[PDB]
Amino acid sequence: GLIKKVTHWSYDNLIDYLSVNPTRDEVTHYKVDPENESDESIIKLHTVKDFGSITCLDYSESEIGMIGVGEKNGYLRIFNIS
Amino acid sequence: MQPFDSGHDDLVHDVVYDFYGRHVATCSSDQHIKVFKLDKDTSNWELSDSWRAHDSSIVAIDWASPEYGRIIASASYDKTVKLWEEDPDQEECSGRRWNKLCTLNDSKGSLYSVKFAPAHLGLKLACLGNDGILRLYDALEPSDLRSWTLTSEMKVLSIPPANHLQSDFCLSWCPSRFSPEKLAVSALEQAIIYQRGKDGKLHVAAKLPGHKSLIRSISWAPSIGRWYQLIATGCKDGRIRIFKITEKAELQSNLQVELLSEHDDHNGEVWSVSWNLTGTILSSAGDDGKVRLWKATYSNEFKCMSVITA
Amino acid sequence: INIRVDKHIKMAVDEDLEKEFEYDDPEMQHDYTIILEPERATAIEKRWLYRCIYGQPSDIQILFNKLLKYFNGKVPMELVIIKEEISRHDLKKLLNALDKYLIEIHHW
Amino acid sequence: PIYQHPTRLTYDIKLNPFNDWQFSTYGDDGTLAIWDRRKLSDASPLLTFEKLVGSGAASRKYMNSCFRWSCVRNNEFATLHRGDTIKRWRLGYYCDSNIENLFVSSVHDTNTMYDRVATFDYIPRSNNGTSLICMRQSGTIYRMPISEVCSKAILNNRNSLLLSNFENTEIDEIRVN
């Protein structure tokens, strides 16, 4: 499980987030409204599922959506979500 | 409830009233001291001055007695105590309304609590930091309030704590002109009452039992005229301990301490405990988010009367 | 065909029961629990088996609910197809959709 | 390379968002350490907490992040212990005179809404608020607020209560009217 806070993407008050499932198989992009404290403020947007075993994750501040994901076999995947 | 923004850019650490109850001084971790006056006409808190004071986070401030002028002490984590005197020939909200008097560069550790003695003891001070050394600073020369002399230096803790372990210290004087000079000093898990002896030096007088964890606040109740004194303590545990003190080597009076009550209503850590002017209403804040108000019953047992959620 | 329940379904039904070590995630460890008799099961075990289908479409749900009691490891699936009048491709769909929870046993 | 400091606490690096000279790693034995780059440049760590985070850092390559820096205010970090409580350590600094020596001032414990939390992260809100998004061991992700705990309740001679919080800046007053 890896929850990484991602900034410099949204122009509204929403704060983006990236999540990795505890089985280390998918990367999920979220969108959280801070002013609303309900559990429905977390909005699931996209999910990339073609992953073997995620070991590390990073994002790109300049370009929106570019997310790199490492793996235990050795395959680094750089792709887009938004 | 009317919330007013103090205007700091960081966490407000200590808030203290003046003697007349119309001025509040707020210290914070943004290295600022702000003094707010209560307007008689608009009945809203408005800022009087806001000046940078220290090079680190200020954690304790205290107003002096109004018969010695308007002096605000300021103990911060940069091992300094700075005394601030108001010169009224300056504009408000400027930074020059409160003039600096003296820096006490004797503490080798980050100071936690500063307190003024009552006016019948003179213009005294009491400092405590993580060095575990209690220091009393007097004001002997009356011509200039810039020559403050260290007089009493009593060691509360044998060795200072390490940087990774947390610590907390608090002080409370004795608001009684008809009793000898006393001082409630709260160490990490210890509460010591220090009394002024016949030799002019402080001595260990009594110890408050209990306190299995860190003491977060100590407060001596005002002696309204009763024969027993009251000390309220808020620990890292949920206990609001109220100690009843009856006063009767080289000490003018030996004193006995009996635990009057012990309340676990907060279910957390009692961060602050305080008293009223007459010692009838106690106020205690805790991790439950609620500030409880305690009043003594007919049978001398304190029972909660109001709970203020936030 | 024998049914299997992994630790994710156990945690999901724990969350549902909450609605009414810890430092690491070793990916080679699975708390596999085999329901021997799906018909003869407790409440939490039937919750396991019903949460195993949470996400599949209506046809798969109906085919699972009509053929859950036959997943006891003793009834051949050919006799199930003959008796219950179901398509063989429907059984293939039900087996392939639930790939990581169905145990195949092949003997005479 | 600019410098090479031999230390065993070389794991997940989180730069401080308010001061880039400070970073914090931990080790195989769970020992957390907050560093300063200038001391290593010139070399002791600025802080060292014995067994604060989960151990076994060399053996397991899939480790949850139970330590986070604070993106709402400076000199603060949250540590999640046993999946139940989050310790918000607040630090204090003093300059020996530009490297600020650090020590622990206050630790605040917040019980989580649901147990068995593996990893967590902050949510910055308005008026210096704090909320925490947490991922459980079952993969459920929820949102939990931080309550406004009163730090000072003082009484006046006019029977007036003044309340100071640990989170925001505003001061609450209950006058006798």
Curated annotation (Swiss-Prot), chain A:
Subcellular location, record wording: Cytoplasm; Vacuole membrane
Coiled-coil positions: none
WD repeat positions: 49-82
Function: Component of the SEA complex which coats the vacuolar membrane and is involved in intracellular trafficking, autophagy, response to nitrogen starvation, and amino acid biogenesis.
More about this protein: Present with 184 molecules/cell in log phase SD medium.
Protein family per UniProt: Belongs to the WD repeat mio family.
Name used for this protein in its record: SEH-associated protein 4
Record's subunit section: Component of the SEA complex composed of at least IML1/SEA1, RTC1/SEA2, MTC5/SEA3, NPR2, NPR3, SEA4, SEC13 and SEH1.
Swiss-Prot record, chain B:
Gene Ontology terms for molecular function: structural constituent of nuclear pore
Ranges occupied by WD repeats: 7-46, 53-94, 106-147, 153-192, 210-248, 265-304
InterPro entries assigned: Sec13/Seh1_fam, WD40/YVTN_repeat-like_dom_sf, WD40_repeat_dom_sf, WD40_rpt
SMART domains named in the record: WD40
Chief location: nucleus
GO CC annotations, alphabetized: nuclear envelope; nuclear membrane; nuclear pore; nuclear pore outer ring; Seh1-associated complex; vacuolar membrane
Family, per entry: Belongs to the WD repeat SEC13 family.
Summary of the function given for this chain in its UniProt record: Functions as a component of the nuclear pore complex (NPC). NPC components, collectively referred to as nucleoporins (NUPs), can play the role of both NPC structural components and of docking or interaction partners for transiently associated nuclear transport factors. Involved in nuclear poly(A)+ RNA export and NPC biogenesis. It is also required for normal nuclear morphology. Component of the SEA complex which coats the vacuolar membrane and is involved in intracellular trafficking, autophagy, response to nitrogen starvation, and amino acid biogenesis.
Note, other: Present with 952 molecules/cell in log phase SD medium.
Protein name: Nucleoporin SEH1
Lineage summary: Eukaryota, Fungi, Dikarya, Ascomycota, Saccharomycotina
Swiss-Prot record, chain C:
Disulphide bonds in the chain: none
Role according to the record: Component of the SEA complex which coats the vacuolar membrane and is involved in intracellular trafficking, autophagy, response to nitrogen starvation, and amino acid biogenesis. Mediates inactivation of the TORC1 complex in response to amino acid starvation. Required for meiotic nuclear division.
Name of the protein in its database record: Nitrogen permease regulator 3
Summary of subunit composition and partner proteins: Component of the SEA complex composed of at least IML1/SEA1, RTC1/SEA2, MTC5/SEA3, NPR2, NPR3, SEA4, SEC13 and SEH1. Forms a heterodimer with NPR2.
Location in the cell: Vacuole membrane
Family membership: Belongs to the NPR3 family.
Superkingdom per UniProt: Eukaryota
